[PDB]
Design a protein around this nucleic acid. Structure first.
Length: 60
DNA sequence: CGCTAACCGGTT
DNA sequence: AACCGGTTAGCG
């Protein structure tokens, strides 16, 4: 038992990245706000950020 | 295979 | 609870 892999839209990717470039971490409220803006689950966004930070430490 | 979303166990 | 680091796994 495992969740389907989410397919982010160009719009979702773009806004997630934009948010990352602005803030490296999100407060719970900032997360919920972003999830609501992009029609995503809180956890999808939480996970995105986390994986994005991982990528960020690799590439620096 | 490369990129990356999702999961697990441990850190704090 | 959130993050981290390592791991598994979907898909172009």
């Amino acid at each position: 038992p495992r969740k389907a892999r989410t397919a982010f839209s160009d719009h979702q990717l773009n806004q997630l990245e934009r948010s990352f470039e602005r803030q490296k971490y999100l407060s719970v409220q900032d997360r919920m706000d972003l999830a609501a803006a992009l029609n995503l689950t809180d956890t999808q966004v939480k996970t995105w950020y986390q994986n994005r930070r991982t990528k960020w430490k690799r590439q620096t």
